[PDB]
Amino acid sequence: SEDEFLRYLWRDYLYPKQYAWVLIAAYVAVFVVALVGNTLVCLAVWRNHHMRTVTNYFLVNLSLADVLATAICLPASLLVDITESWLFGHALCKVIPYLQAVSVSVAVLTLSFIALDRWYAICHPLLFKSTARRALGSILGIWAVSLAIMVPQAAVMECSSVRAFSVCDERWADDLAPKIYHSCFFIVTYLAPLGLMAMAYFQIFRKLWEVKQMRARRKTAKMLMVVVLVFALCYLPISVLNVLKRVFGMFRQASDREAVYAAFTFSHWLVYANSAANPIIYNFLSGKFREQFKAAFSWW
Ligand SMILES: CCCCCCCC/C=C\CCCCCCCC(=O)O[C@H](COC(=O)CCCCCCCCCCCCCCC)COP(=O)(O)OC[C@@H](O)CO
Ligand SMILES: CCCCCCCC/C=C\CCCCCCCC(=O)O[C@H](COC(=O)CCCCCCCCCCCCCCC)COP(=O)(O)OC[C@@H](O)CO
Ligand SMILES: Cc1ncc(OC[C@@]2(c3cccc(F)c3)C[C@H]2C(=O)Nc2ccc(F)cn2)c(C)n1
Ligand SMILES: CCCCCCCCS[C@@H]1O[C@H](CO)[C@@H](O)[C@H](O)[C@H]1O
Ligand SMILES: CCCCCCCCS[C@@H]1O[C@H](CO)[C@@H](O)[C@H](O)[C@H]1O
Ligand SMILES: CCCCCCCCS[C@@H]1O[C@H](CO)[C@@H](O)[C@H](O)[C@H]1O
Numbered sequence: 067s068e069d070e071f072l073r074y075l076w077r078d079y080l081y082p083k084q085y086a087w088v089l090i091a092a093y094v095a096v097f098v099v100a101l102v103g104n105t106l107v108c109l110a111v112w113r114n115h116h117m118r119t120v121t122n123y124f125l126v127n128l129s130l131a132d133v134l135a136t137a138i139c140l141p142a143s144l145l146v147d148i149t150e151s152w153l154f155g156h157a158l159c160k161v162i163p164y165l166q167a168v169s170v171s172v173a174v175l176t177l178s179f180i181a182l183d184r185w186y187a188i189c190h191p192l193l194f195k196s197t198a199r200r201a202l203g204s205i206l207g208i209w210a211v212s213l214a215i216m217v218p219q220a221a222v223m224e225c226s227s228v229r230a231f232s233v234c235d236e237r238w239a240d241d242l243a244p245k246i247y248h249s250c251f252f253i254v255t256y257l258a259p260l261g262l263m264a265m266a267y268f269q270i271f272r273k274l275w276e277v278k279q280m281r282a283r284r285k286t287a288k289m290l291m292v293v294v295l296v297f298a299l300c301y302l303p304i305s306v307l308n309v310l311k312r313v314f315g316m317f318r319q320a321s322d323r324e325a326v327y328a329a330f331t332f333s334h335w336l337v338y339a340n341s342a343a344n345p346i347i348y349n350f351l352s353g354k355f356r357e358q359f360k361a362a363f364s365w366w
Contacts, residue, residue, distance in 0.1 A: 086148070092335055093144045096342045100136040103345030104129035110348075110358035117354055121286060123201040124180045125348070127208065131172035132341035139166035140338045147331040152234035156225040159234035164220035170301075170337075171212035174259050177294060179204050181266040184290065188270050188283060215254075218247070248312035256305045260298050267291050289351035293344060300340035303333035 107129040111117050142162045145153060152159055186194050224237040238244045267290070274284050307330060310316040317326045348355035 089147065089331065089335075090144070093140065093147075093338070096335070096338050097136060097140050099346070100132060100140075100338065100341035103342060104132045104136070106359055106362050107345050107348065107355070109362070110355055114354065114358060117358075118198060120183050120196050120198060120201045121180055121290070123198060123205065124176050124183070125344075127205045128173055128176045128344065131169045131176065132344065134172075135166055135169040136338060136341050138162060139169070143334045143338070146234070147327075147334055149231075150327060151231040152225055153232075154234075155232075159225040159232075160220045160223045163223050163234065164216055166337075167216045167219045168212045170255055171216055172208055173297070173340075174255050175208045175212060176205075177263060177297060178259050179208065180290060181263045181294070184270055184287065185266045188273050188287075189266075222247075244312045248308055252305055252309050256301055260294065263294050264298075267294065285352070289347065292347050292351055296343050296347060297340060300336045300343065303329075304337055307333050 108126050111122050111126050139162055142154060142158070143166075154162065183196050187196065222236040222238065223234060225232045225234050226237075236244065267287070270287050271291075274280065274287055307317075345355075345359075349359050350356070
């Protein structure tokens with residue numbers, strides 16, 4: 067009887083709390099490291115004028131998209147990942163998924179414009195001029211586009227009541243629309259930008275691997291390839307799971323509901339883990355950012 071008791075103690079009590087601890091610790095750790103890290107990126111560029119480059123201005127914009135997701139959307143995701151219900155009412159059911167989707171769009175477009183800049187600077191020079199004022203113009207353009215293209219996402223979000231509990235999920239009048247929408251969503255936010263980026267960085271790799279500038283360029287190119295690779299890894303589970311669910315009608319079966327919950331939770335958590343990842347990447351793969359981060363830890 068002793069083995070059976072230890073098995074139910076594990077299933078009914080020890081495993082669920084171990085799960086809750088790991089889930090909350092992981093989300094809190096990501097929240098702190100992403101909030102501290104991304105503010106320090108913004109500070110590193112503001113305090114050091116030599117760091118005020120086109121790439122670094124776009125990296126500040128990537129950190130602000132990261133702060134938008136970490137401040138507003140990360141707590142909301144954590145509680146849905148815990149309760150599997152919506153506790154912020156009808157209004158925030160439209161607002162919060164919209165802001166998180168907008169932040170992904172900004173992140174993707176910011177990276178695209180970085181790749182583009184490096185590709186024209188290194189692979190095809192003298193064709194297009196790239197200045198800091200023009201980087202701000204592109205930065206504003208990225209926000210206007212991300213804010214507009216994510217309105218359809220806000221539109222389908224509905225807070226449904228059916229102890230009575232609300233759920234925040236997409237509402238679809240027909241079976242065809244979610245399939246077309248989530249196919250476009252995935253291609254535009256993930257597959258086409260990263261595919262184009264991987265090909266651009268590979269050309270930059272071929273060109274880079276005037277001597278002093280070529281040494282500087284290789285350091286930044288190595289770092290940005292890591293930022294893109296880490297972004298592609300962090301976003302792959304959520305992108306695939308969304309396509310499998312919305313385009314291939316998977317995970318509708320309730321045989322192992324918790325297995326699906328755990329897969330979607332880890333996938334939601336990884337998106338936020340990305341905001342904590344970037345300042346850590348700039349710390350190890352950038353000596354200039356590291357100096358500012360070391361200065362911040364020594365001062366505070
Ligand atoms: C980066 C490269 C891309 C470059 C392209 C750049 C293009 C930039 C141009 C214009 C952007 C302007 C924003 C348009 C705003 C979107 C307008 C909008 O809100 O759509 C509603 C209808 O659609 C809906 O719900 C359901 C949406 C239907 C989607 C079906 C698929 C059509 C294909 C479309 C796929 C796009 C996916 C974009 C992914 C990022 C109508 O709302 P309504 O007023 O009634 O009040 C809300 C009420 O419906 C709440 O229930
Ligand atoms: C929406 C947001 C848009 C805004 C984002 C802006 C992004 C701006 C960034 C960088 C500038 C891009 C520079 C790209 C440089 C292109 C580099 C290049 O020439 O490499 C070719 C790869 O082509 C290829 O296969 C093509 C790759 C196909 C494989 C599919 C990968 C993912 C999809 C890829 C996306 C398609 C987008 C198309 C939009 C018009 C070599 O050819 P290959 O002789 O080996 O061929 C035969 C063999 O591959 C057949 O299997
Ligand atoms: C709990 C939770 N449910 C779904 C989630 O993401 C699902 C979505 C998405 C698809 C592909 C890549 C993404 F990066 C995000 C649809 C977007 C959203 O942004 N949805 C959204 C965001 C926050 C939120 F609280 C509720 N829904 C998340 C990230 N968290
Ligand atoms: C933070 C969210 C808390 C984690 C919840 C996931 C753990 C479920 S484990 C286990 O699943 C069995 C299904 O048969 C039930 O009988 C038990 O009661 C339960 O303990
Ligand atoms: C190519 C033209 C693109 C326009 C596509 C519009 C199709 C409407 S889908 C419809 O939108 C509603 C918004 O109120 C949701 O509530 C529904 O549940 C959803 O199914
Ligand atoms: C504009 C691009 C959008 C095209 C994608 C719509 C076609 C749906 S694929 C189809 O969907 C079913 C879901 O029920 C699955 O059963 C099938 O296995 C799968 O093959």
